[PDB]
């Protein structure tokens, strides 16, 4: 369980849980060709630049911790 | 546990588990209570670790198997339970201890703790030990530790194999004998758990070994033969062609020694060397088989257990190469021999042989001797066992 990333426990903080679901959402975006293409349509960029901005947002999201 | 603390318990236990009159069961039960209390107590046991191991290390060397797997388990729980530095700093003074007993069982201890906390964590300790310039006994111990790590960890040695070799290599040339012997033995254990991979990691080790193969008398020689033996399957059929053809000579000459350690080694050797795809049948048929069935097939061997099994295997493989009718044809006449255990041996041998190669190779007359042999042997059964029947 521990070595499986995303494992929660009783002491789990807000920040960690939400940054988890963030990163997992981003791996889903990298995963599904379409939804990615939807993103590229809406905000106009390349598929590439989209995935790049996401890979930048992987570590950050929500910004600094508390 | 958390209430009373480890101190009072062990103070009131270790005398009992140390008792001269101790049972089998009572022992095992006190082992159980030591486990169950050591699933809880973690930081607490630090002062008692040695005070535990002293009683427990005798469990590792024992005639009972279940006692051994228990012992390895509880030392695993202790080392992992305590800290690395706790174990290390604990167990040093037993390395140079006068008695070799504690040195040995201590080596198996380091094997267990190294399985617990992993090889790389404990490496610098060892690599420091085998280079100790004080006295040889230490290096002997540490090398034995390398071995027992090889046996215990086994297949999982693979990643650190290189570093381990780089440690052990310096003992092969040492002035003391033991260190050389146990060293090359440890190489053997490695390669046997190294089944084929990492050949070049053993690389720098070879050239001395082969040289030693020339000049040695006694047990150390046989040990080298053990190592080289497990090595050869890991070489290339071209290099191992030459090197093998060199080993075959000494292998031949050395069949005749009364040493049973010898006969074990050279036996398993003959398996690996002559079970090589790059070896020619006729050469074995001429040079080997007649001395092989002469010296090796005798009533000294079969009465023993390990020699029995290993003999079975080696003979099976020789059949796997030279073919069926040869081996069987030579050993059929022994089905009618007086003793049981011997008959049992040739019987299970015929069994495995005809299991693998198939009966198609067998001619007619030898088949008459077969069926008659099998009936005859089957008609006299002192004990109940499958070997004759499955056979």
């Amino acid at each position: 369980q521990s070595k499986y990333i995303g494992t929660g426990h009783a002491d789990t903080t807000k920040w960690e849980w939400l940054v988890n679901q963030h990163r997992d959402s981003y791996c889903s975006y990298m995963g599904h060709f379409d939804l990615l293409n939807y993103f590229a349509i809406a905000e106009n960029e390349s598929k590439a630049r989209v995935r790049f901005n996401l890979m930048e947002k992987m570590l950050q999201p929500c910004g600094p911790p508390a | 546990a958390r209430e009373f603390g480890a101190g009072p318990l062990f103070n009131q236990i270790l005398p009992l588990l140390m008792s001269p009159t101790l049972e089998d069961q009572e022992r095992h039960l006190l082992v159980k209570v030591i486990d169950r209390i050591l699933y809880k107590l973690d930081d607490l046991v630090r002062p008692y670790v040695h005070k535990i191991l002293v009683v427990i290390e005798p469990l590792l060397i024992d005639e009972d198997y279940y006692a051994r797997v228990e012992g390895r388990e509880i030392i695993s729980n202790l080392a992992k339970a305590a800290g690395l530095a706790t174990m290390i700093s604990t167990m040093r003074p037993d390395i140079d201890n006068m008695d070799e007993y504690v040195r040995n069982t201590t080596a198996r201890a380091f094997a267990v703790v190294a399985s617990a906390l992993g090889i790389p964590s404990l490496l610098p300790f060892l690599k420091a030990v085998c280079k100790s310039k004080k006295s040889w006994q230490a290096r002997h111990t540490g090398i034995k530790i390398v071995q027992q790590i090889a046996i215990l960890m086994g297949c999982a040695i693979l990643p650190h194999l290189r570093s381990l070799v780089e440690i052990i290599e310096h003992g092969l040339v040492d002035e003391q004998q033991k260190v050389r012997t146990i060293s090359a033995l440890a190489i053997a254990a490695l390669a046997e758990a190294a089944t084929p991979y990492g050949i070049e990691s053993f690389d720098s080790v070879l050239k001395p070994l082969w040289k030693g193969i020339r000049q040695h008398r006694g047990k150390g020689l046989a040990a080298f033969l053990k190592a080289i033996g497990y090595l050869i399957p890991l070489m290339d059929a071209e290099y191992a062609n030459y090197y093998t053809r060199e080993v075959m000579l000494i292998l031949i000459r050395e069949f005749q020694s009364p040493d049973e350690e010898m006969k074990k080694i050279v036996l398993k050797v003959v398996k690996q060397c002559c079970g090589t795809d790059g070896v020619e049948a006729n050469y074995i048929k001429t040079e080997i088989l007649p001395p092989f069935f002469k010296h090796f097939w005798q009533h000294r061997m079969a009465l023993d257990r390990r020699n029995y099994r290993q003999l079975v295997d080696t003979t099976v493989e020789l059949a796997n190469k030279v073919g069926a009718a040869e081996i069987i044809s030579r050993i059929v006449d022994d089905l009618k021999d007086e003793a049981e255990q011997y008959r049992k041996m040739v019987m299970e041998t015929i069994e495995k042989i005809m299991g693998n190669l198939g009966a198609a190779d067998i001619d007619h007359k030898l088949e008459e001797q077969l069926i008659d042999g099998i009936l005859y042997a089957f008609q006299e059964q002192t004990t109940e066992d499958s070997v004759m029947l499955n056979g």
């Binding site: 494992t7 963030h22 889903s28 | -």
Partner: protein, 260 residues
């Protein structure tokens, strides 16, 4: 194999002799026994022999009763259970408790062996599970929960989820206890219910429990939420609710709000 050569009378005698072979201390004996009992169940037909199973005194624990239960299962397979169920479900009525939990087990193994065919009988078993899962004594909740599990794996994908949700209601309070067998039972239960119902409903029961002040509730709901989390982690994305952003952190994922 042959089974015709022998008249039925001999067979039923074989039955009444087979019944006490279940005292065997060996597992393979019981194995062959139950499988045979299925074979002769084919040679005769269900009703009589399943009645002879329901005769059982239950007298000792395991070592065994539940082997007779297995016979009830395999017997229910050998000819359609589509016949057999009403007798059993009626035999839950009996006030003797250990045979009540017995027939609960019979349903468990029953669905385990039938698999897909439970797309119908789910309804029949549903109210009885209601009565059983509503607790007389812990073993009821446990065994009934196991039934919910195997049912839940078996029916998957065929569109019966509704009644499984209803049963999930009554399953849900049992989450809390320290008894190992009932807690691991409930775990298996909610796992099968996870795959059958789909994660969304699960998570909608598991949200509030995560952050609740008490330690207990958090321990458990986080255990559950982990069980839901490891599998189907890919499909969870949509169902995380909207959580407002605080000072130092932005907790809104705006990607989903991009509109063409």
């Amino acid at each position: 194999r042959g089974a015709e050569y022998v008249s039925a009378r001999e067979w039923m005698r074989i039955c009444f002799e087979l019944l006490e072979l279940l005292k065997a201390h060996k597992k393979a004996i019981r194995r062959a026994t139950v499988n045979t009992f299925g074979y002769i169940a084919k040679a005769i037909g269900p009703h009589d022999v399943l009645a002879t199973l329901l005769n059982n005194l239950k007298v000792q624990e395991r070592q065994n009763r539940v082997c007779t239960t297995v016979a009830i299962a395999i017997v229910a397979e050998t000819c359609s259970p589509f016949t057999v169920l009403p007798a059993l479900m009626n035999e839950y009525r009996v006030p003797e408790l250990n045979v009540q939990n017995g027939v609960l087990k019979s349903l468990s193994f029953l669905f385990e062996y039938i698999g897909e065919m439970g797309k119908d009988y789910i309804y029949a078993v549903t109210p009885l599970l209601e009565d059983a899962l509503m607790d007389r004594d812990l073993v009821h909740r446990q065994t009934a929960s196991a039934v919910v599990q195997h049912m839940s794996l078996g029916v998957y994908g065929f569109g019966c989820e509704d009644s499984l949700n209803h049963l999930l209601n009554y399953v849900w309070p049992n989450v809390f206890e320290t008894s190992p067998h009932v807690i691991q039972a409930v775990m298996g239960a909610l796992e099968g219910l996870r795959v059958a119902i789909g994660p969304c409903r699960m998570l909608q029961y598991c949200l509030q429990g995560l952050f609740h002040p008490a330690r207990k509730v958090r321990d458990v709901y986080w255990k559950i939420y982990n069980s839901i989390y490891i599998g189907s982690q890919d499909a969870l994305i949509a169902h995380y609710p909207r959580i407002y952003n605080d000072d130092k952190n932005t907790y809104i994922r705006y990607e989903l709000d991009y509109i063409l």
